[PDB]
Ligand binder design. Structure first.
Ligand SMILES: [Cl-]
Ligand SMILES: [Cl-]
Ligand SMILES: [Cl-]
Ligand SMILES: [Cl-]
Length: 135
């Protein structure tokens, strides 16, 4: 793994805490570097979004990072998310009952539904990204 990949993995691990704001700022900064590094970041989010069951936090945290990247990361992040809208839409139905039979999947479904809606709302996203760049 590259350094950027280790950070993305750290920020999307099973640890029930995180990612932090600094974690997401760091990952966002990685998307403004080489195309190779940008692709390494998105590929690792892609890999985490494919996890299931007990590893549900990998999916929830990766959706958190991805929503942050669509608003603060490079424009290529928005392009990746739109090109891969299928993945995000599929996660709107994610299910995972834990040991006490609580469906921790609700967290993932909400985040996926919210991200699909943000990607749909092109003008809203444009103005939110412009405000981020303004600052
Ligand atoms: Cl982990
Ligand atoms: Cl898994
Ligand atoms: Cl940009
Ligand atoms: Cl809506």
């Amino acid at each position: 793994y590259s350094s950027a990949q280790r950070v993305v993995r750290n920020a999307t691990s099973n640890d029930p805490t995180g990612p932090t704001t600094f974690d997401m700022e760091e990952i966002s900064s990685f998307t403004y570097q080489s195309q190779t590094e940008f692709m390494e970041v998105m590929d690792m989010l892609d890999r985490r979004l494919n996890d299931k069951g007990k590893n549900w936090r990998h999916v929830a945290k990766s959706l958190t990072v991805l929503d942050y990247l669509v608003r603060y990361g490079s424009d290529k992040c928005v392009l990746w998310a739109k090109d891969n809208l299928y993945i995000i839409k599929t996660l709107r139905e994610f299910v995972h009952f834990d040991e006490t039979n609580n469906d921790q999947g609700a967290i993932i479904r909400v985040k996926a539904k919210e991200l699909v809606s943000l990607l749909r709302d092109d003008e809203r996203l444009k103005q939110e990204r412009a405000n981020a760049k303004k600052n």
